[PDB]
């Protein structure tokens, strides 16, 4: 679903100050949908 | 000329692996099952759209 290949894929990136982000204690959205534009990319998916 | 040969099919199979995954049109149930590989963002970030 779009929890596992962008949310998941969110917290992989290594972090600005470097690196990992494992263990670290974030807060996503539970459902994402596209709501329109140009074009349906692969969507800002934003994970804090 | 083997080598030439078999640089032009590579090259044209790497072309054809980034286009099917970069297709559209798999948006898709499909899209479930699809990973974007390492060897594809290089490509992006170098021909952009």
Redesign the interface.
């Known amino acids: ?1 779009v929890i ?2 962008k949310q998941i894929s969110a917290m992989k990136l290594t972090g600005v100050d470097g690196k990992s982000q494992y263990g670290n204690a974030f807060i996503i959205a539970n459902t994402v949908k596209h709501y329109g534009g140009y ?2 990319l692969g969507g800002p998916i934003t994970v804090y | 000329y083997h080598e030439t040969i078999e640089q032009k099919k590579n090259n044209r199979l790497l072309e054809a692996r980034i286009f099917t995954r970069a297709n559209p049109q798999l948006s898709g149930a499909i899209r479930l099952g699809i990973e974007r590989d390492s060897v594809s963002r290089s490509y992006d970030e170098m021909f952009g759209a």
């Open positions: 679903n596992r290949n074009s349906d």
